[PDB]
Each structure stands twice: as structure tokens, then as C-alpha cells.
Scaffold this motif. Sequence first.
Motif, PDB file in Angstrom:
ATOM      1  N   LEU A  61     -73.949 -66.362 -57.674  1.00  0.00           N
ATOM      2  CA  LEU A  61     -73.751 -64.959 -57.313  1.00  0.00           C
ATOM      3  C   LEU A  61     -74.908 -64.376 -56.519  1.00  0.00           C
ATOM      4  O   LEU A  61     -74.688 -63.560 -55.627  1.00  0.00           O
ATOM      5  CB  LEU A  61     -73.431 -64.093 -58.539  1.00  0.00           C
ATOM      6  CG  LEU A  61     -71.975 -64.101 -59.042  1.00  0.00           C
ATOM      7  CD1 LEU A  61     -71.863 -63.272 -60.310  1.00  0.00           C
ATOM      8  CD2 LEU A  61     -71.016 -63.581 -57.982  1.00  0.00           C
ATOM      9  N   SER A  65     -74.772 -62.666 -52.367  1.00  0.00           N
ATOM     10  CA  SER A  65     -74.982 -61.212 -52.277  1.00  0.00           C
ATOM     11  C   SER A  65     -75.439 -60.743 -50.889  1.00  0.00           C
ATOM     12  O   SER A  65     -76.451 -61.201 -50.359  1.00  0.00           O
ATOM     13  CB  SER A  65     -75.930 -60.716 -53.368  1.00  0.00           C
ATOM     14  OG  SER A  65     -77.252 -61.157 -53.123  1.00  0.00           O
ATOM     15  N   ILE A  72     -67.390 -60.310 -55.579  1.00  0.00           N
ATOM     16  CA  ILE A  72     -67.933 -59.410 -56.578  1.00  0.00           C
ATOM     17  C   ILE A  72     -69.465 -59.507 -56.567  1.00  0.00           C
ATOM     18  O   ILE A  72     -70.028 -60.604 -56.502  1.00  0.00           O
ATOM     19  CB  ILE A  72     -67.359 -59.740 -57.967  1.00  0.00           C
ATOM     20  CG1 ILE A  72     -67.329 -58.480 -58.828  1.00  0.00           C
ATOM     21  CG2 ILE A  72     -68.067 -60.955 -58.591  1.00  0.00           C
ATOM     22  CD1 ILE A  72     -66.272 -57.497 -58.352  1.00  0.00           C
ATOM     23  N   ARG A  73     -70.129 -58.363 -56.590  1.00  0.00           N
ATOM     24  CA  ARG A  73     -71.587 -58.345 -56.496  1.00  0.00           C
ATOM     25  C   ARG A  73     -72.252 -58.389 -57.875  1.00  0.00           C
ATOM     26  O   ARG A  73     -71.888 -57.614 -58.762  1.00  0.00           O
ATOM     27  CB  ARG A  73     -72.041 -57.099 -55.736  1.00  0.00           C
ATOM     28  CG  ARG A  73     -73.554 -57.003 -55.586  1.00  0.00           C
ATOM     29  CD  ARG A  73     -73.987 -55.709 -54.906  1.00  0.00           C
ATOM     30  NE  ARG A  73     -73.331 -55.527 -53.614  1.00  0.00           N
ATOM     31  CZ  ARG A  73     -73.750 -56.053 -52.463  1.00  0.00           C
ATOM     32  NH1 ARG A  73     -74.839 -56.818 -52.413  1.00  0.00           N
ATOM     33  NH2 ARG A  73     -73.065 -55.812 -51.353  1.00  0.00           N
ATOM     34  N   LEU A  74     -73.225 -59.283 -58.039  1.00  0.00           N
ATOM     35  CA  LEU A  74     -74.069 -59.319 -59.232  1.00  0.00           C
ATOM     36  C   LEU A  74     -75.158 -58.257 -59.102  1.00  0.00           C
ATOM     37  O   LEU A  74     -75.996 -58.323 -58.206  1.00  0.00           O
ATOM     38  CB  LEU A  74     -74.706 -60.693 -59.429  1.00  0.00           C
ATOM     39  CG  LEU A  74     -75.617 -60.852 -60.658  1.00  0.00           C
ATOM     40  CD1 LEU A  74     -74.792 -60.776 -61.942  1.00  0.00           C
ATOM     41  CD2 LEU A  74     -76.417 -62.153 -60.606  1.00  0.00           C
ATOM     42  N   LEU A  88     -71.855 -56.754 -63.196  1.00  0.00           N
ATOM     43  CA  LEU A  88     -71.096 -56.887 -61.969  1.00  0.00           C
ATOM     44  C   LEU A  88     -70.660 -55.527 -61.499  1.00  0.00           C
ATOM     45  O   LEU A  88     -70.375 -54.650 -62.317  1.00  0.00           O
ATOM     46  CB  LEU A  88     -69.859 -57.763 -62.220  1.00  0.00           C
ATOM     47  CG  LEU A  88     -70.158 -59.111 -62.899  1.00  0.00           C
ATOM     48  CD1 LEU A  88     -68.895 -59.816 -63.354  1.00  0.00           C
ATOM     49  CD2 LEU A  88     -70.971 -60.009 -61.972  1.00  0.00           C
ATOM     50  N   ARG A  90     -67.956 -52.931 -60.396  1.00  0.00           N
ATOM     51  CA  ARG A  90     -66.554 -52.817 -60.776  1.00  0.00           C
ATOM     52  C   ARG A  90     -65.841 -51.783 -59.908  1.00  0.00           C
ATOM     53  O   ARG A  90     -66.190 -50.605 -59.936  1.00  0.00           O
ATOM     54  CB  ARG A  90     -66.405 -52.505 -62.276  1.00  0.00           C
ATOM     55  CG  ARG A  90     -65.039 -51.984 -62.694  1.00  0.00           C
ATOM     56  CD  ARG A  90     -64.937 -51.786 -64.204  1.00  0.00           C
ATOM     57  NE  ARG A  90     -65.812 -50.723 -64.718  1.00  0.00           N
ATOM     58  CZ  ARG A  90     -65.521 -49.419 -64.739  1.00  0.00           C
ATOM     59  NH1 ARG A  90     -64.366 -48.949 -64.255  1.00  0.00           N
ATOM     60  NH2 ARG A  90     -66.404 -48.565 -65.247  1.00  0.00           N
ATOM     61  N   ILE A 153     -63.864 -63.046 -58.064  1.00  0.00           N
ATOM     62  CA  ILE A 153     -64.716 -62.991 -59.250  1.00  0.00           C
ATOM     63  C   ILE A 153     -64.807 -64.332 -59.944  1.00  0.00           C
ATOM     64  O   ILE A 153     -64.059 -65.256 -59.642  1.00  0.00           O
ATOM     65  CB  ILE A 153     -64.185 -61.968 -60.289  1.00  0.00           C
ATOM     66  CG1 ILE A 153     -62.771 -62.367 -60.745  1.00  0.00           C
ATOM     67  CG2 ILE A 153     -64.248 -60.562 -59.709  1.00  0.00           C
ATOM     68  CD1 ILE A 153     -62.282 -61.641 -62.003  1.00  0.00           C
TER      69      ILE A 153
END
Length: 273
Positions: A61, A65, A72-74, A88, A90, A153
Amino acid sequence: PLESQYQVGPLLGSGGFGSVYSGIRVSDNLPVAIKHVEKDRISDWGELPNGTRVPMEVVLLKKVSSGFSGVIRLLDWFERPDSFVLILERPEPVQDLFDFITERGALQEELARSFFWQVLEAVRHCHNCGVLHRDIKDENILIDLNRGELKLIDFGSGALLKDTVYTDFDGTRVYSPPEWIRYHRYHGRSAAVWSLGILLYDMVCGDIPFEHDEEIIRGQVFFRQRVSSECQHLIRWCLALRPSDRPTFEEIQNHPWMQDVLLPQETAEIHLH
Ligand SMILES: CC(C)(C)CNC(=O)C[C@H]1CNC(=O)c2cc(-c3ccsc3)cn21
């Protein structure tokens, strides 16, 4: 540190991947998901640039980025005595592709095209960042319902992308390619393309095309819904039994069926709102 920074809301889901909760970042009220994975349950481990032992998902992850919203971004992660916790981003409102298909049945091709295109862009981004997802499926795709944007995800079965053979796999069996089933061997990109053909079939037919190992190995595709010849061709191409017979990502995106994709916002306007 963790409990003070986030307001934990309801459980969103749990399973082999761990437990995921809705949350809110206390500082600015940003919607987040809070993913807990027990240490004993962690498949693969990696290490950070600064050399810290973390779940592979954390490594993967971080690698993906950037300002690109397809993955989906950490936002942050935490180590606990017996677990890791991942924060994460949302989307809100959100619905996974599995539920979306369940409630709407097979998707109109225009919609499947927009969705599949975005998945392809997200997966290419992963590959470009040296990350192989290994579990592309409807349950691992979130739909940002307002924006018409899909997000990939769960990198918990992922791996660093490599050009040599993979002999381990812990993604979803019914999306896994015949070479994995038969030989316990696959290459990253061509296995990904197989799972994408399963996904695309799923979108336009409302269910996956194969349930049993024997069906995966036979690779004979039957269309249970009316699907255009061009869409059928692309699916059957992605699902070529021989990995080298499968299209490259460039070939998928240049396919006649993939032309004139809707923008995500147009997609939400026409299909989601
Ligand atoms: C569609 C939901 C209502 C969100 C339920 N799905 C999951 O919990 C699947 C779970 C599978 N593994 C993951 O890593 C994961 C991340 C998320 C997530 C990420 C942002 S909002 C929800 C959700 N997951």
C-alpha cells in the motif's frame, strides 16, 4: 495514540482478511476504515524502506500511494502486541462491487465498460508501482457512489511484482487461473488478466463463470446473459487457457469493446444517481 486519533464506528466486514471497522479521524472528521489483522494470521511479511517488519499489505500500500484515486489509500498503520491496524481512506457513500451486482443483476455494458476500465487503470497503477494485487474480484472493489470512482482494496494476498514464476497463492480460487489450479505456478500479469476476465464476466453476467476447478481448467465460457460479441471476445481472450495467449493490459484497453468509456462522473450521473 491509535484509540485517541480515531473514533471507531461499526464493523464493516470480517473474514480471512481480518476485521474492518468504519471510523472517523478525530482531527478533521475524515471518513476512514480501520483494518485489524492478527499477527498469527499474516500470510506474507515485508520490511519498510527504513527496515521495519510489517505485513506485506503495508509495504504494498505504501508503494501505490500517490494522488491517483483508483487504489485505496493507506493513511497510517499501527503495530499492536498481537495485531496490525491499518487506517484506510473510506469513500462515503460506498458500496462494494459484489453488493452492487447482487442488487442490480448483470450490469449494462456501458456501465461494465466504465467500471472495468477503472479497474484496469488501478491495476496498471499497481503494476507500475511494482505491486501485484493477486485478489482482484468484485468484493475487493469499492464504488464511490457519488463520484462514480472505483477503488481497489485489500492487498493482503498481494506481492511485489516480479517477472519470474509465483508458486504461492492465497487469493480467491474461483478467480485464479488454470495454470495455478493445474501446476501451482503462474506469472503475475497474465494471472491478473485471467482474474480480470472473470471479473468482467461477473459484471456483465451477474455471476462468475466457473465454480469448480474442472471448469477453470476447461476454460469453456458460457454466457448466461445477453452479452455483445465484442464483450464476449474480450472475456474469452482474457480467459485464454495459455497465459501467453491472454491480452496485455494495453491490448485490453485498445480492444474495440473498451472504446469511448464514460468518465467516472458521467457514470455516476447516468448509472448511480
Ligand atoms: C463493502 C464493505 C461494507 C466496506 C464491506 N467490505 C469489507 O469489509 C471488505 C474488506 C476486505 N479487506 C480489506 O482490506 C478491506 C478494506 C475495506 C475498506 C477500505 C475502505 S472502506 C472499506 C474493506 N475491506
